[PDB]
Design a binder for this molecule. Structure first.
Ligand SMILES: Nc1ncnc2c1ncn2[C@@H]1O[C@H](C[C@@H](N)CC[C@H](N)C(=O)O)[C@@H](O)[C@H]1O
Ligand SMILES: Nc1ncnc2c1ncn2[C@@H]1O[C@H](C[C@@H](N)CC[C@H](N)C(=O)O)[C@@H](O)[C@H]1O
Lengths: 246, 246
DNA sequence: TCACAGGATCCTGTGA
DNA sequence: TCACAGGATCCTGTGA
């Protein structure tokens, strides 16, 4: 139940409790997928979408690389737990070539495996005093053994077109919380998502949305109310982890 | 790829993408140079010109000062993040003596490191609740290790005599935008620059001009059209950052 | 004088 | 108890 890469917000753990609610579908849509904690572990076909083209091209790529391919690039850069400059180079190189395979290595050495990218589309995460380890290849493998049941998409959720008959799984940025990618989020976003989430219901299209109603101080009222029109399955400084669905 | 001093409009970041277009030259001309983000980082010889003699004399000066020289003047004024009056003094002193080294310290405590000067030639930037920090000396050093490949000029661009064989790099005030130094700018200026920029072309002299075609709602049509006669390499509330060149 | 890009890490679940 | 993998923030410098 591993994700292809370590990823902030990943769901490895909750998938179990999360599948217990999944309806049937002709296509599984992972609207916001990042880590692929879900996609790599649901029943095909899977439309894995995420707005971050870098991470999505990185997947498209990975499909044909091999663990050796990977190991090679590392040896070639002589990267390791304390290789700060070797890192900074690999960064520059990515930034220039925009070669997906390189992003995949970097993510292994970033500060807390963060994959942060800027306006200009550059990888800017600071060194993280780390490199690959056991799970590295396990993650690597697991990806390669399951990605063939996936189709990758890199569109704003509001553009993925949902067909009638597929199941949509939403796990977007949590308003109240703050991971890096919340830079792509706002209330105006929480809104369109929630309104369109409605649309999908009227079209008799089943959906599943994981999020937090309260975390660390503030609360998501907009959804706290919206959440009524549909179900709920509370899961939780205490943050209330829920699964709002139909 | 640091500039000698923090500076509004600086190009630290775009230099990379900007060098990828630089032609060959016997002399690099930095027509409008302020921050020295470019000059300090191109291949000598470099004719760094800027109209603001204060900032230019400040450089001519700096050539012989030492980080200690610098630190000294600070200690001597007991300046720091909250030293508002100590600041105001250092200001007066500059205003009176017109001693370049002092301007260099001030710039470190100005509101947003602005180096604003008036008709009477006085430093008038308000206190900025700040003083030196890490980058201060880095900036300081980088200047001192590269300035020897530079010749400083403080003339209106329309006078900086261009020789046949050098490359001219233009990055003047952006019409549509408004930094302090746009006080030296106008359409009549955009014009002379553009017309003379033509002249340089006819003389078979290569030139490079960074600017914005559109920012914050308005647009620079005069150049939007003029920009056709030559190349373009779009880089970008969205502002369109471009590099018009031959 | 705040909005923003960008260098930074301990606290924690978990196999041993 | 113990080592290791893994992350829904942090602070500081900076200003078209
Ligand atoms: N407008 C948007 N459209 C699509 N994806 C977005 C948007 N804003 C943010 N995201 C992505 O939404 C994701 C949120 C994550 N918590 C998804 C986690 C994922 N299901 C996992 O378990 O690995 C990230 O991968 C973000 O890059
Ligand atoms: N007529 C003029 N002649 C020469 N310089 C001028 C004139 N009007 C304005 N300037 C200067 O042109 C500059 C525009 C700046 N954006 C140059 C930035 C510089 N390339 C840097 O990145 O540090 C300022 O330093 C202004 O002081």
């Amino acid at each position: 139940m591993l994700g292809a890469i370590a990823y902030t917000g990943n769901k490895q753990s909750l998938l179990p409790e999360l599948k217990s609610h999944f309806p049937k579908y002709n296509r599984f849509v992972d609207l916001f997928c990042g880590g692929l904690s879900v996609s790599l572990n649901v029943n095909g076909p899977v439309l894995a979408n995420d707005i971050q083209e870098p991470i999505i091209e990185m997947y498209k790529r990975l499909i044909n690389v091999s663990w050796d391919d990977v190991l090679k690039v590392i040896k070639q850069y002589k990267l390791s737990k304390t290789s700060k400059e070797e890192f900074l180079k690999l960064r520059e190189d990515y930034n220039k070539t925009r070669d997906p395979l390189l992003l995949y290595v970097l993510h292994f050495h970033g500060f807390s495996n963060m994959i942060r990218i800027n306006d200009k589309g550059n990888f800017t995460t600071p060194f993280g005093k780390r490199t690959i380890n056991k799970n590295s290849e396990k993650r690597f493998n697991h990806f390669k053994q399951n990605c063939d049941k996936i189709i990758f998409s890199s569109l704003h959720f509001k553009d993925v077109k949902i067909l009638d008959g597929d199941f949509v799984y939403v796990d977007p940025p949590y308003l109240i919380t703050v991971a890096d990618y919340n830079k792509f989020w706002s209330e105006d976003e929480e809104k369109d998502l929630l309104n369109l989430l409605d649309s999908l219901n009227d079209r008799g299209i089943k959906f599943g949305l994981s999020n937090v109603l309260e975390h660390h101080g503030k609360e998501n009222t907009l959804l706290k109310e919206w959440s009524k029109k549909y179900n709920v399955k509370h899961l939780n400084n205490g943050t209330d982890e829920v699964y709002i669905f139909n």
